[PDB]
Amino acid sequence: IILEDQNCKLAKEKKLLEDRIAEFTTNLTEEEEKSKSLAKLKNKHEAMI
Amino acid sequence: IILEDQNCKLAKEKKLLEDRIAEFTTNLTEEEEKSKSLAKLKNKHEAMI
Amino acid sequence: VTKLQVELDNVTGLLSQSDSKSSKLTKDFSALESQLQDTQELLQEENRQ
Amino acid sequence: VTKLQVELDNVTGLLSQSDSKSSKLTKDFSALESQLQDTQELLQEENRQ
């Protein structure tokens, strides 16, 4: 009986964690490209300079 | 044991997701720090270029 | 001019350090924000259950 | 020299704004810590009830 309440609680938490991970992981893709793209942008000014 | 086995494997998901969500969120912000840090440093090259 | 150029690199380093400190807080902000979402959203399920 | 001095003021202002902006981010990081602990305690205590 105690495991049912604990298992049910972990089930809802696991479902919400995976759903929230996609909301943050999706932004990491855009930030990863923007962060990496900005890195080469600084090198462009150095090469142009 | 069968119920504990499912809860045992399911508990790792809630713990892994909770532990991965902290790293995933920090990973997304890591690009912002590098992008912002590189953007600030790149601004110096822009003013110099 | 030559001294200010080298001095500008040192001054620019402080901007990255200050930005890293400010961006570092945002790293934990997204982690805590994502954790609060899993907890705040779970709070609604707690009352429902 | 004058251009580098102007950039130094902007660089000093950027680092100062970043450090000052980091102080405001501490409220969000500190608020989430108190909210996460309160939400975590509420979720944990909800299981006991």
UniProtKB/Swiss-Prot annotation, chains C, D:
Summed up, the tissue specificity of this protein is: In the kidney, expressed in the glomeruli. Also expressed in leukocytes.
Quote the PTM field.
Answer: ISGylated.
Where does it localize? Cytoplasm, Cytoskeleton; Cytoplasm, Cell cortex; Cytoplasmic vesicle, Secretory vesicle, Cortical granule; Cell membrane
Tell me the subunit arrangement. Answer: Myosin is a hexameric protein that consists of 2 heavy chain subunits (MHC), 2 alkali light chain subunits (MLC) and 2 regulatory light chain subunits (MLC-2). Interacts with RASIP1. Interacts with DDR1. Interacts with PDLIM2. Interacts with SVIL. Interacts with HTRA3. Interacts with Myo7a. Interacts with CFAP95. Interacts with LIMCH1; independently of the integration of MYH9 into the myosin complex. Interacts with RAB3A. Interacts with ZBED4. Interacts with S100A4; this interaction increases cell motility.
What disease is linked with this protein in Swiss-Prot or TrEMBL?
Answer: Macrothrombocytopenia and granulocyte inclusions with or without nephritis or sensorineural hearing loss: An autosomal dominant disorder characterized by thrombocytopenia, giant platelets and Dohle body-like inclusions in peripheral blood leukocytes with variable ultrastructural appearance. Some affected individuals lack leukocyte inclusion bodies on classic staining of peripheral blood smears. Alport syndrome-like features of nephritis, hearing loss, and eye abnormalities are present in some patients.
Q: What does this protein do?
A: Cellular myosin that appears to play a role in cytokinesis, cell shape, and specialized functions such as secretion and capping. Required for cortical actin clearance prior to oocyte exocytosis. Promotes cell motility in conjunction with S100A4. During cell spreading, plays an important role in cytoskeleton reorganization, focal contact formation (in the margins but not the central part of spreading cells), and lamellipodial retraction; this function is mechanically antagonized by MYH10.
Q: Which family does it belong to?
A: Belongs to the TRAFAC class myosin-kinesin ATPase superfamily. Myosin family.
Q: What is stated about domains?
A: The rodlike tail sequence is highly repetitive, showing cycles of a 28-residue repeat pattern composed of 4 heptapeptides, characteristic for alpha-helical coiled coils.
Could you identify this protein by its name? Myosin-9
Q: Please report the organism this UniProt entry assigns to the protein.
A: Homo sapiens (Human)
